[PDB]
Every structure is written in structure tokens, then in C-alpha cells.
Amino acid sequence: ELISENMHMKLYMEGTVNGHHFKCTSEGEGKPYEGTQTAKIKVVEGGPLPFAFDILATSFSKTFINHTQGIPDFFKQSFPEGFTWERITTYEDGGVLTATQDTSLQNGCLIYNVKINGVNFPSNGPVMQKKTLGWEASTEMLYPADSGLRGHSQMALKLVGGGYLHCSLKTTYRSKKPAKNLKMPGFYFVDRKLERIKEADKETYVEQHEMAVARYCD
């Protein structure tokens, strides 16, 4: 019940991509039970980034998923302790972006800390050439594994000039709450779309929106 109808989040992010160091911060809010949220994001060091902001988008919030059909909510159950997540995104043209994240709750506000390693992005590929046009909608499948929850998804990054770049995502979410105090879900799906409200100055400011809704087969 530490998770109310409207919640605010604050985030710190640091990492490198192809050797380029950067940091970002964000402030956001959303409706955890409706599965919607928006974050206002700033590149605060290393800007303007020499790579498409799109590769960072999935690293800016699992408490904001509308868990329907009575699906136990691993994320909302984890508070006040919180949870971590860890992920590899593999791009078909050779780049990989891993991220590790901590989610905690401090004085009613969600606090995210994220670490990023982006490696081997092709120098003349669309990510390093900033020739990308955002993500299509996607679905993640989630089920218990390794004492946490494993998630898998595939995403398509739209490209300037047509065509898409395919990626796979593989995540593990880990609760910082004793397992005995968690009701695990069974296998399920989360459908989500990630959109921009606005951006400015070579992606050094981006306002990002996500809607995410959990379900079974339909």
C-alpha cells in the first residue's frame, strides 16, 4: 500500500556506449495501477550523445504495469524493500546494451539508479549514425526463474529510409523482499508501447511515455 494511485519517480543513469561516457537524470510520474507513466529525461554529462537515444529508452520502471486478471504483481509486492533488474539487449547488427538497475522507495518517491554498458555498436550503423525512428509496440513474456522473474521480449527499431533493426531483450527481476513474503505469478505477458511526448536539442532532453498492461492469452 506504499504504492498509491499517483507516484513520482526520480532516476540517475551513468554508462558508456562504444567508449563514450554519459550520465542522464529523469523526473517522472505515473499511475502504477493503470500502467501509464511519463518521464522527463535530461542528458547531464556527455551530451549531445553520439548515438541514438532510442537505445537507452527501455532503461528509464516496472512498478507502473497494470496487472490485470488477478496476476500477482511481483513489482508492487516487493515494496517497501524494492527490487533490481538486469538486462541484455542484443541488436542484430552487433551492438549490445546491458543495464543493471536498482529500484527503491524513499519518502514516497520511487528512486532508480541505472548502470549502462553499450558495446560493439557498428560505427556506420544506424544507432551510431543517429538514423533511428523509435520502437514498435512489444510484448514481454515473464515467468519465475532463478528465484526471481525472468522476462524475454523482441523489439523492432524503425530506421530512417525504411526497414527495421531487430533486437532481443533478456531480463531478470529480483525482489529485495524475502521470498516467503511474495506470491509468485505464473507465466504471463505484458504488452507495452513506448512513445515520445517531445524532445529537444539533439535528444539531450526527452519526454518519454509508456503504457504497459499485463495479461494472459487473448
Q: By CB neighbour count within 10 A (0-12 exposed, 13-18 middle, 19+ buried), where does 88 fall? A: middle
All residues at 6 or more sequence positions from 132 whose CB lies less than 8 Å from its CB, including other chains:
52, 54, 126, 157, 158, 159, 160, 165
| 99-114 CB burial, b ≥16 within 10 A, e <16 | bebebbbeeeebbbeb
Tell me how far apart the alpha carbons of residues 128 and 80 are, in angstroms, rounded to a whole number: 39
Domains in the chain with CATH codes: 1-218 (2.40.155.10)
Experimental technique used to determine this entry: X-ray
Tell me how far apart the alpha carbons of residues 8 and 128 are, in angstroms, rounded to a whole number: 32
